[PDB]
Subunit: 462 residues, 4 copies
């Protein structure tokens, strides 16, 4: 009588274990200390991991190999990386309309960035697994154990909901696989048709308060599309697009259980994390001798590491030597998150020192996480202008060094939320209370996220 | 050992609500017996989940099925008799997708036209039973969406939680099917290399070597003409199951957007579904439900079928005369198909409608071995397809497709084939949770044999 | 000892004649009076016609059927027609560099017009047969029989060269077939690669005195091309383009001898003029009951008729009823040539009356032939501004009526000649003496012709 | 009855002028004997005409021939023995293009790799003669570029005007070949329908029916896989002839632009040319001329060829080791090819160069019938190709192509084939101006036979 349904779990499948040699390596890596982990019983975690070891994967190795090839092109300055989605996915909002809205928002941004960059845009959603977060404080403002994301505990402000529940590992997988199934369906459908997506962009221009500002570029894009059609271009590639899946690799119980061995028809068999295509390590879990970095070493997926204002050029180089030991362009993405007031100063010496190693990382801008403040109305928020300005500074840093501004990583949604201040809608502190729906950080709403794409497209054209 | 889901706390057009309600108020056979309050809670959860399929895919399938109905493509439908939660694994799903693709390339070459590939996967978790009590005195197993296979009373109790578990398993499997078909798994060259290995290491491989080599030379010719890899890297595999548990199917209904004609109810648990022999009551809820949804649908037709009732199905389920909207799945027994099928085909053809005529050569050819196993002889399966082709050839109508039960596993479930599986062999790997499936070699051998029927 | 080589002629092939019924129709049509015909002996003309009846055709029926399909799209407002080349081709200048230059100039114009129009451009060269012209006066300023074009007599100002020589019919065919062979080779080569052609346009923008003016659009075109490549567009259609062949059908001895019966695998067999893909009838030979119009009725090719300032709406309708009797969109092109000072007034009532017939002609602008004057330095010339202004007025006429401004027909060359006044080079009366090379009317040089395309592209965008 | 052309009234790089001059100062066999002043005037005209081919096409052909040399494509070269001005007509040109395309589809399927199509057209107007005086006591006919076929003295005088007439005819023919190959003439489906008609109405059609049906099923399979019309509508047919008359070839030289490496002399009278058995003197002008031009070139090799001299041709004509730059055309007689060819192939292969090994099964198998006609037996032609394949099969080398004399006409020139053309039949339609050609049926029958050699 709690209005919840229990779904029984079975670990019946008989599947061979991972090879002894790879397990031996994995065990040695996971013996390292791991920050920010859930505190549930080991016996229960083991049982859940055992279930997840036998489930169909979310992604397959050939997709990850294909992504790696596309990311190598980004690292070489021949493509641009767009990564975006919810700050925190919730099980409650993991619905068709919400997923479709986020996929749509990403695609809308991508066509604008493609035109502005004059090169392919690799589209990576924060989706199908972004269910876990780190917490700075053990006790939140309400005197409760902190919400850690839906893979660990519940958002609701009650004690029972905040207890760490290892059954969530399986609920997370169910939600991730369901979302990924839909993302695949949507991208191979008309939704990712280039003409349809740009029609939405055209509507945005009509009805945005600053639409006059973006009308020139929008018209130019439309004339570019029309030109393709006029040139008799095969329409086949226009109809569908590839959207990859990503999340912060935080809960090692989940990530380790989703490891699979590739079939070895591409090269040599090895460990892939098939919970996603690519994952990144967060600022609070990137300890150089910690388990997260060690885990990222062992897997074959492309990986990223968040770099905040305390980053040194020397530590950045250590990440490069640990995580890109074979010098594979695009294998490693370094995600700069410095604050708009600091990026121009702190980023250049890191870029210089890393470039001198001879490795080719992707330099990606996260203009969100270094630009967060609390409004006077109590809401955790970010100003659009500061977000835009960090990307601007990021481009200036790279332009001065002759290096590639390789992409952005943003928190966005297709919803008309009121979470970030500013944009052409001029969202105010007062407005924030209307639709502040994020379970964690403030997201750019659908209009703000498209406006950012127009602005970044202009930076690319400069 | 429970994961737990929260029960969530825009209305249909009035006419669709009225029609759905009317369909569901009709009597429904073979339904689980679980409490209505619990079923409702499970349905409420399922009404909020991401769909297994989307309407544009179903519209696309309908277009491809119209081509089949017009005699311009061929329908291959196949997979497990019963999917189980236990066996819903990567190797098993990959094996079945592979088996289907292997058959498809052979049938494509033999038919000289496209083959529409529809898998009995991502939802085939419910079955009817003639008897509530089985041979062991237990309440019958009705598939994993309803109760458990294990032969004990507690496991056989009907459990509405399985509705959600079924969705979880379906969506996981569908995700993988999509991934596998966009991969190199569905590259033509790769798939036909597997067929070449089969020819080397089959006891009757000499028999199929000529056609296998001809296919290989056909593929090479494509490459030689400079037309390779344009469309060969990928394929579309659609999802199907018997629409049996109305609690599940109704909860997976979604209303389409106004982009295509008018808004319509689609069953997004699958691309296409069929109504079985025990649930096709003409005034029953299953047929009424099939009338309300926009998916392509099929109806199983067994040996008691009359030409007149077949026409009544056509007029109820294809009221607007949409080629391929309706598939009539003949399942008559190899000894009866030649006698019973022609007067049904004639009467239906005279209506001016264009159904897909599909052969189910499995369900009319089942017997029990002396070793206790429920089995089917390969020869009888082949012979029903043969007779089905003869019927259509004599009438000038289109033998439109097959519907088979198969797996990529090396099971020992059906007698015969080039491996010459015997009654004794059956005990080695009889793994089906319901009917005997053609194993990977038998299913490929059938494709070679059907390809020769197509060439004749 | 005249520095000429005689090439012997043989009429040896044994080929079946045209069907008796079609010949009966053709004879009845050619019994009509024909203006502007050469005055060579009938016996000699017959012998030359007999030779030409057996030679390989310049074009084939399937190409003409394909052109007709593309012209139907123009007539329906879904494509734009670009027709251009020398005023008069000469045998002496029928060389690889000159042909390549003209093909290049046309392609350069086409990519700009394609982008501006946002729809396909049908490319029809005045080439591989434009060897005959009408003369108003029997005696020219030098007291000689007038030059009639190289199919009839020689440009050189001497009596012997000006005598009408029926062997020219065969020399014309030799030159036409040679030129057509090269046009085919050039268009299926890298020359008609879209990227290569637009690079030339980019160079033009750098070095034109008014390049600043066209830089915006040129950059936009470049970004449009880059976008195609970024979208992963199949490059196959970009590599090659179709350039069709056209000329004024003037010398009926030539045109009748180049008639062939199609093989009848498309529809019914009928008469095609295989000296070209499409031909037009000139202002001085378009007598409604004359042989040229009657000849155009009998052939299946798409045809055009020049319409000058004396045209009435009623006569225009008669052309439509004679030449498009089966109401086939694009079969008939009406080519308006009214003078820039008259087009806005004279064109509308013609368009209205023709549109009311229910037929769909292509409305094409010839902004050259109504805008010709004689400079004070003696040269026959045209001002660029007047040429541009007639096209401008032509667009205004159609915009007001809701009808389709369907194309242009211009005289151009890839040479850096000094024939038309004005353009960004500001060609003056004095400049004309430097490189006035036309054997008849003044052509837009390569820079002027590309500048016109930019200007017309802007008209299309308005 | 003369058309008259005006004699027209940027220099080569110094090294190319020096090398061209040196090549042309060497002795040249089999040249016409006409006055130098008149030849010069004709050359001056030809130096100003539009070229028959362009350098980018020749570069593209070189790339495709490299693939042949590497064992990844097959070369089909064919057409009239001697083109005539009289027969340079639309029906005749279309017929020959059609015959070549028909052969090509069959060879493509049999080889399981692309076929490079090179026609002996648009320039094959000159031939050598062993004797200046022929059997009638007249100065020999040397082809229409030199003198006339008619058996009278005045017509046999060497006339430099024919140089221009040859160009006029070549450029006209090339224009049509281009038009025809971009049309539906070169649609695969259309061309193979003609092959199906041939099978119906050949006296030995039963023999080729299996392969013809297999090809048809291969084409249908392409269409079924959704890959039809992407590349099937058109094909590339290149132009070739024996480079014999140096006045013509030198006048048709053009210097390429700097876009590709460095500027080079291309002979733009054709895409590729070969040097004949009577003009391949190792220190002669023809070989020297072939060294200076950038086109792919070939050399005919008859039964007096040594392995050592073959190597000397390879080292002179392929000095930079460019696969496919050089084609060695074996022409040994069917009774000799097995004996003479292997030691040549071995010695050449040991050099590390990759030539194309091409079989000319015509010119070593010619005899005079008792009815006076110069003829060849079909069986001997087939047997030389057979032996050529056996030679390469034993050595592990690539049987790279054939070079045949054919026409789309139903002539009676070669004995045998399924029509069983006899000595008596030869008088009906013996139309060749030089050697006996395979007629349209014989040429297609050869393709079927060679396709089976390729499949073995
Ligand atoms: N074999 C599945 C495991 C599974 C699949 C999908 C899922 O969302 C959860 C769990 C079961 O036993 O139920
Ligand atoms: N909204 C999802 C519902 C869900 C998704 C996936 C699934 O397999 C079952 C149930 C949740 O709360 O968990
Ligand atoms: N058969 C050609 C006719 C011909 C072809 C080409 C040409 O340019 C002129 C004349 C001849 O007798 O010469
Ligand atoms: N410039 C050409 C030369 C020419 C072209 C074509 C041809 O067949 C022969 C000669 C002329 O004066 O006629
Ligand atoms: Mn965040
Ligand atoms: Mn079954
Ligand atoms: Mn003019
Ligand atoms: Mn010969």
């Amino acid at each position: 009588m709690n209005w919840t349904v229990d779904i029984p779990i079975d670990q019946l499948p008989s599947l061979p274990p991972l090879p002894t040699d790879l397990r031996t390596r994995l065990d040695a890596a996971l013996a390292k200390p791991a920050a920010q982990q859930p505190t549930w019983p080991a016996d229960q975690a083991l049982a859940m991991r055992t279930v997840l070891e036998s489930v169909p994967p979310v992604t397959v190795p050939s997709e990850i190999v294909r992504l790696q090839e596309q990311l190598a092109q980004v690292a070489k300055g021949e493509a641009f990386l767009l990564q975006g989605g919810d700050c925190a996915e919730t099980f409650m909002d993991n619905t068709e309309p919400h997923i479709r809205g986020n996929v749509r928002a990403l695609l809308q941004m991508a066509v604008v960035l493609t035109y502005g960059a004059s090169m392919p845009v690799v589209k990576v959603a924060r989706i199908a697994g972004q269910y876990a977060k780190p917490r700075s404080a053990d006790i939140d403002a309400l005197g409760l154990r902190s919400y850690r994301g839906d893979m660990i505990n519940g958002f609701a402000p009650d004690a029972a909901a905040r207890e760490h529940d290892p059954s969530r590992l399986v609920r997370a997988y169910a939600n991730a696989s369901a979302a990924m199934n839909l993302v695949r369906a949507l991208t191979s459908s008309g939704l990712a048709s280039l003409h349809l997506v740009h029609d939405w962009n055209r509507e945005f221009v009509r009805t945005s308060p600053a639409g006059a500002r973006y009308e020139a570029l929008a018209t130019e894009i439309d004339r570019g599309l029309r030109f393709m059609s006029a040139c008799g271009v095969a329409d086949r590639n226009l109809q569908t697009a590839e959207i990859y899946a990503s999340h912060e690799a935080l809960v090692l119980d989940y990530e380790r259980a989703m490891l699979r061995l590739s079939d070895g028809d591409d090269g040599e068999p090895q460990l892939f994390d098939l919970s996603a295509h690519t994952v990144w390590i967060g600022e609070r879990t990137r300890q150089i001798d910690g388990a997260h970095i060690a885990f990222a070493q062992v897997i074959a997926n492309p990986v990223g590491v968040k770099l905040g204002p305390n980053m040194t050029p020397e530590l950045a180089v250590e990440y490069v030597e640990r995580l890109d030991p074979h010098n594979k362009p695009g294998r490693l993405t370094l995600v700069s998150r410095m604050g708009n007031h600091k990026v121009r100063d702190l980023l250049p010496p890191i870029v210089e020192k890393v470039q001198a190693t001879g490795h080719q990382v992707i330099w990606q801008c996260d203009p969100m996480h270094g630009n967060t403040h609390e409004s006077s109305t109590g809401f955790k928020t970010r100003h659009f202008d500061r977000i835009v300005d960090e990307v601007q500074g990021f481009f200036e840093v790279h332009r001065a060094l002759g290096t590639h501004p390789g992409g952005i990583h943003v928190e966005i949604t297709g919803e008309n939320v009121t979470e970030c201040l500013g944009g052409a809608q001029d969202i105010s502190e007062t407005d924030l209370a209307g639709r502040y729906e994020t379970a964690c950080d403030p997201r750019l709403n659908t209009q703000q996220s498209l406006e950012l794409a127009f602005l970044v497209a202009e930076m690319l054209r400069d």
